[PDB]
Amino acid sequence: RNQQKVVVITGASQGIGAGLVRAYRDRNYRVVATSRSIKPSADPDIHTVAGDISKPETADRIVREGIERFGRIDSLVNNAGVFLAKPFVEMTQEDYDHNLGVNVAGFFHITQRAAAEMLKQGSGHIVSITTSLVDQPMVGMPSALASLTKGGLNAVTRSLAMEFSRSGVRVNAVSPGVIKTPMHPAETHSTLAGLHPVGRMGEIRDVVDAVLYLEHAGFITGEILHVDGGQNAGRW
Amino acid sequence: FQSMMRNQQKVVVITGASQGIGAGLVRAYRDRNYRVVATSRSIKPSADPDIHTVAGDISKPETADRIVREGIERFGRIDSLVNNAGVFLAKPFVEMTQEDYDHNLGVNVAGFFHITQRAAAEMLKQGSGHIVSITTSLVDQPMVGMPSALASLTKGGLNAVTRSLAMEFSRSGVRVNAVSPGVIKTPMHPAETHSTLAGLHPVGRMGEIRDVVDAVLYLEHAGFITGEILHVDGGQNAGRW
Amino acid sequence: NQQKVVVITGASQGIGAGLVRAYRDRNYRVVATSRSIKPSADPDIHTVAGDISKPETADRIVREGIERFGRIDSLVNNAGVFLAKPFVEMTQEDYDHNLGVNVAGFFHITQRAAAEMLKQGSGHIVSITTSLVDQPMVGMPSALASLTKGGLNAVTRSLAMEFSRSGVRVNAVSPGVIKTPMHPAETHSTLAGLHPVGRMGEIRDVVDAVLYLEHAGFITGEILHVDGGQNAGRW
Amino acid sequence: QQKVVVITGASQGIGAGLVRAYRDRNYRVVATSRSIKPSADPDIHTVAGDISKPETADRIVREGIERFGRIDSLVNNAGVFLAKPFVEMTQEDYDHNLGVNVAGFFHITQRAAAEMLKQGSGHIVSITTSLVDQPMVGMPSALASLTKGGLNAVTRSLAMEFSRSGVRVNAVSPGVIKTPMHPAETHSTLAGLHPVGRMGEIRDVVDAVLYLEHAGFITGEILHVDGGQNAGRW
């Protein structure tokens, strides 16, 4: 039990976030969980850390506090993220700074710090949560900042997979379709379902299972795994 | 009730089931309590009553018929199909013969095509199914020094039809996926070749039967995935090493 | 014999004839084939009639071309068929016909041509696939176009790698729905709508794509989509 | 009456090849770079600036609208490239790469696009890199993959967005191109980074851009001009 692997999960307060915290706990990992807003936990194997993930300082804190508490860092799930649907010509300098802060710098900084720790242990797993919009964008869903920002995460997943190829660190991505959260109003479900060839929305368990499959799949790196009800496969 | 649940278990057809990857899928499917129709050119019958064995040339329409017929006769339903039968040839393209062409077309394409047509007819009929094919990462990432035009042709075909049929069967409850392995450690790969075959992956080691098997079973239970190609390949598909 | 020589398959109708003309205009001699092709007045176009599924047709084509023109420099695989049909309905005859034209058609000539191109240390082989390979559609059931042309996209990357160090380049052009005579103006309205740009392609679009690949010496193993955006996302 | 093209990173060798090729086609050209001397040619308007700044995009577009009355085409060719282990990358490496590679595409594209949308017609092409789709062991470049990889995907995303508006959006993904930046003692090594075993020439990329410029039925396409890099492992 001081033998358990430690995962760092970002955006841990959100809907997929909690689901991931719970599932990693269920698979005998200790968790360092991080959010803008996260509150401390009863569970002595869940260490929470609150901070703005886009700030280099926050990343420094996550890992430092994680090493001090548990003795190591083995995995990282990059789940901090914002989405914005807006016509490209209408986006403002504020829309830009906000997406580049959360989706890009909030990947880059912990990923760098967590990777240092793994490289030195000769072992690890980085998984980032991306979006099927990267590979398959849609007419009627304008989100140029999502493609820019998440598409860079797909490509850097493959790049780091190569860079860390002989080091024992594996680097993967899960690209979901539209996932039912509380923050998605009940009225919007008929049309959101219709965004997927299968005609259902995703469920949190769908994505969480993909992450845990990749966590335990020791021959998989550089892989982008689509959990999107068919979205990436073709046009519906 | 538990007896009721046994006599009504999911049913998978597994092709190329005799050894290596296929024989591993049989056991893994049994471990999750599927019943199994295992086929191979020469599979011997099993002592497990929940494995039905059917010996035959998978490239013939008549074998596909039989597999499903005897499948239905013995278990009443067909839920899933793993196209695992496959041949692989390494040969410069300009030296490939008519015989090589027929052999690969037959097993890799006709093999896939007939059983898939018949299994899908049943899955459509009952409104739910899973079809998964085993392909190669040479489809998406071929390599200088590994000349295998026929594998690309035939397996590249399976990759494309996997997405095609995922769209066609979108509204029917039938999911369609592939697993695209790297070079997997099998008895048919003698020890002398292992260190060479290992450097065929960015990660510098060979794949295991367990890796490919777990990918198929993960797709099997992943009710929100269709038309997906899951590369299990030590990073081959990701980039150049 | 200074003029480069191209073999163009499915030369008779549609893209293929557009292709003969384009390559003639760039000073190539042409060996042109299809089931029904008729002899040409042009001394620089030699026609060969035959069923491209048969190894004998390929054998004729290459040897007749080496006879008249003394070499082979390029091959454009443009013979092809297409069948819209529910997968569970496809028949043995549907299977043999598609495999024969789409796959065997490609294999025999590509093999004989590639051998000539390898000995010389130079060549270009380009194949016409379809955007349904990467981007198939709900309501366009074509399992056989996918098996068939998908194998061509993949073999394109494969032979690109294999001929890598030899100076032979292998590419593919993957069109959307292209406006031939074969499509009644009844259909045009419906077919335009299978592209994000809401426009059918012209023959010019595909032909210029082939001619571009043919003069782009640093491109190999590429799939160039000429598809009004079909491959790029969901409309 | 002549079409108008904006070309970023116009002082680089690719940049200068593009300027000439578009002039050979009778376009008027707005050419920007950090340092670019004014032009003799009434038909080439140069704007000096740092493209990482939004202010610079504003100026480029309004100056082209001022001089020539329209913008038909945008070529994003500004770029930097850093080879460095991911774990050694500094705040300054980061801000630099994000500035030139992402911001340097984004603002200029947003302004040129507003103009093209108004006329109902246009072309946006961006020069990315083969490392996005085919990264290489021993070429560590996380920031290049992060920045140019966003470019590829926005390329397909804007092709869908502008789909019914008459604006085409495409990309050219080159291999290693023979440039003054690469000394001759290095060529034999860079050649080996393509399955084909040679480096590219300026004209290979330039023709690719001009081909896409004249190809009215292509949008959302990444065209790989890379000696086979994207196609497989060599």
Give DSSP secondary structure letters for A133-149: TTTS-BTT---HHHHHH
Among chain A residues, the shortest Cα distance to D152 is held by A151
* Alpha carbon A20 to its chain's center: 10
Residues linked to residue D233 through DSSP beta bridges, in sequence order: B143
Q: Please give, rounded to a whole number of angstroms, the shortest distance from the CA of A139 to a CA of chain C.
A: 5
Q: Please give, rounded to a whole number of angstroms, the shortest distance from the CA of D24 to a CA of chain A.
A: 31
The residue among C195, C197, C57 whose CA lies nearest residue C132 is: C195
Among chain D residues, the shortest Cα distance to B143 is held by D233
* Cβ contact, residue pair D87, A112, below 8 Å: yes
* Alpha carbon B140 to its chain's center: 17
C142 contacts B164 by C-beta, under 8 angstroms: yes
Size of chain C, expressed as the number of residues it contains: 235
* Cβ contact, residue pair B144, D229, below 8 Å: no
Q: Which amino acid does the sequence have at C77?
A: N
DSSP string, B30-80: HHTT-EEEEEESSPPPPSSTTEEEEES-TTSHHHHHHHHHHHHHHHS---E
Structure tokens at D183: 């000394």
Residue located via tokens 């099927």: A132
Report the CATH number at residue B132. Answer: 3.40.50.720
DSSP string, chain D: ---EEEESSTTSHHHHHHHHHHHHTT-EEEEEESS----S-TTEEEEE--TTSHHHHHHHHHHHHHHHS---EEEE---------GGG--HHHHHHHHIIIIIHHHHHHHHHHHHHHHHT-EEEEEE--TTTTS-BTT---HHHHHHHHHHHHHHHHHHHHTTTTTEEEEEEEE--B--TTS-GGGHHHHHTTSTTSS-B-HHHHHHHHHHHHH-TT--SPEEEESTTTTT-B-
Q: Which of B144, B202, B236 sits opposite D234 (nearest CB)?
A: B144
Residue D179 to residue D172: CA distance in whole angstroms = 17
Return the number of CB contacts < 8 Å for A and C.
29
Testing the interface with C: which of B60, B94, B109 to mutate, by most C Cβ within 10 A? B94
Sign of CA dihedral A135, A223, C150, B143: positive
D220 contacts C233 by C-beta, under 8 angstroms: yes
Q: In what order do the strands lie in the sheet with C5-8?
A: C45-49, C29-34, C5-8, C74-77, C123-128, C168-175, C223-226
Residue B83 to residue B97: CA distance in whole angstroms = 25
Residue C122 to residue C109: CA distance in whole angstroms = 16
Helices B209-221 + A204-216 axis angle, to 10: 180
Q: In what order do the strands lie in the sheet with B229-232?
A: B51-55, B35-40, B11-14, B80-83, B129-134, B174-181, B229-232
Backbone angles phi, psi at A178, to 5 degrees: -85, 120
* Cβ contact, residue pair B202, A161, below 8 Å: yes
* Cβ contact, residue pair B142, D231, below 8 Å: yes
Q: Please give, rounded to a whole number of angstroms, the shortest distance from the CA of C232 to a CA of chain A.
A: 7
* Cβ count within 10 A of residue A183: 7
Q: Which of B171, B222, B241 sits opposite A165 (nearest CB)?
A: B241
Instruction: Name all chains with 3 or more CB-CB pairs below 8 Å to chain B.
Output: A, C, D
Chain D residues near any Cβ of chain A (below 8 Å):
54, 85-87, 89, 91, 94, 98, 102-103, 106, 110, 113-114, 117, 131-133, 135-137, 140-142, 144-154, 156-158, 160-161, 163-164
Among chain D residues, the shortest Cα distance to C212 is held by D211
Residue C17 to residue B59: CA distance in whole angstroms = 38
Q: Please give, rounded to a whole number of angstroms, the shortest distance from the CA of B173 to a CA of chain C.
A: 14
A83 contacts A133 by C-beta, under 8 angstroms: no
Q: Which amino acid does the sequence have at D105?
A: F
* Cβ contact, residue pair A230, B167, below 8 Å: yes
* Cβ count within 10 A of residue C41: 5
Q: Which of B142, B236, B239 sits opposite D135 (nearest CB)?
A: B239
B187-to-B19, B237, C142, D87 alpha-carbon distances in Å: 9, 25, 38, 40
Q: Which domain holds residue B83?
A: 1-241
Backbone angles phi, psi at B232, to 5 degrees: -125, 85
The residue among C142, C145, C147, C149 whose CA lies nearest residue C86 is: C142
Among chain D residues, the shortest Cα distance to B202 is held by D137
Question: Which residues, including other chains, have CB under 8 Å from residue A120's CB and lie 6 or more apart?
Answer: none
Among chain A residues, the shortest Cα distance to C197 is held by A139
Which helix (H) or strand (E) is A211 found in, with range? helix A204-216
Q: What share of chain A is helix, strand, coil (3-state, %, to 5)?
A: 45, 20, 40
Residue B204 to residue B197: CA distance in whole angstroms = 9
Helices and strands of chain B, counted as H and E runs = 8, 7
Q: Please give, rounded to a whole number of angstroms, the shortest distance from the CA of A68 to a CA of chain D.
A: 21
Q: Which of D134, D136, D195 sits opposite B144 (nearest CB)?
A: D195
Experimental approach? X-ray
Q: Using CA atoms in the order C142, C147, C150, C151, what is the torsion angle rounded to 10 degrees?
A: -160
* Cβ contact, residue pair C234, A236, below 8 Å: yes
DSSP string, B167-199: HHTTTTTEEEEEEEE--B--TTS-GGGHHHHHT
* Cβ contact, residue pair A227, B227, below 8 Å: no
Residue C76 to residue C113: CA distance in whole angstroms = 11
DSSP single-letter state for residue B210: H
Residue located via tokens 């494309």: B160
Among chain A residues, the shortest Cα distance to B171 is held by A198
Q: Please give, rounded to a whole number of angstroms, the shortest distance from the CA of D93 to a CA of chain B.
A: 24
Q: Please give, rounded to a whole number of angstroms, the shortest distance from the CA of C158 to a CA of chain A.
A: 21
DSSP single-letter state for residue A202: B
Question: Which residues, including other chains, have CB under 8 Å from residue D165's CB and lie 6 or more apart?
Answer: D117, D120
Residue C27 to residue C16: CA distance in whole angstroms = 17
Rg (CA), chain A: 17
Rama region for B109: left / alpha / beta (φ>0; ψ in -120 to 50; rest): alpha
Q: Which of D221, D225, D232 sits opposite C225 (nearest CB)?
A: D221
Sign of CA dihedral B6, B12, B18, B20: negative
Sign of CA dihedral D200, D80, A146, C198: negative
Enumerate the residues of chain B whose CB falls inside 8 A of the CB of residue D134.
239-240
The residue among C22, C24, C25, C26 whose CA lies nearest residue C46 is: C24
Testing the interface with B: which of D141, D230, D233, D234 to mutate, by most B Cβ within 10 A? D233
* Cβ contact, residue pair A104, D113, below 8 Å: no
Enumerate the residues of chain D whose CB falls inside 8 A of the CB of residue A93.
54
C206 contacts C175 by C-beta, under 8 angstroms: yes
B22 contacts B40 by C-beta, under 8 angstroms: yes
Rg (CA), chain C: 17
Domain count, chain A: 1
* Cβ count within 10 A of residue C113: 25
| 3-state secondary structure at position B19 | coil
Question: Which residues, including other chains, have CB under 8 Å from residue A27's CB and lie 6 or more apart?
Answer: A212, A215, A216
Enumerate the residues of chain B whose CB falls inside 8 A of the CB of residue D233.
141-144, 236, 240-241
* Alpha carbon C164 to its chain's center: 21
The residue among C117, C128, C108 whose CA lies nearest residue C205 is: C128
Residue D108 to residue D53: CA distance in whole angstroms = 9
A11 contacts A35 by C-beta, under 8 angstroms: yes
Question: How many angstroms separate the first and last alpha carbons of chain B?
Answer: 55
* Cβ contact, residue pair A162, B227, below 8 Å: no
C45-to-A76, C8, C10, C158 alpha-carbon distances in Å: 63, 11, 14, 31
* Cβ contact, residue pair B142, D232, below 8 Å: yes
Residue B20 to residue B23: CA distance in whole angstroms = 6
CB-side neighbour CA atoms (13 Å) of A76? 30
* Cβ contact, residue pair A136, C196, below 8 Å: no
How, if at all, do strands D44-48 and D28-33 pair?
parallel
Enumerate the residues of chain C whose CB falls inside 8 A of the CB of residue A234.
135-138
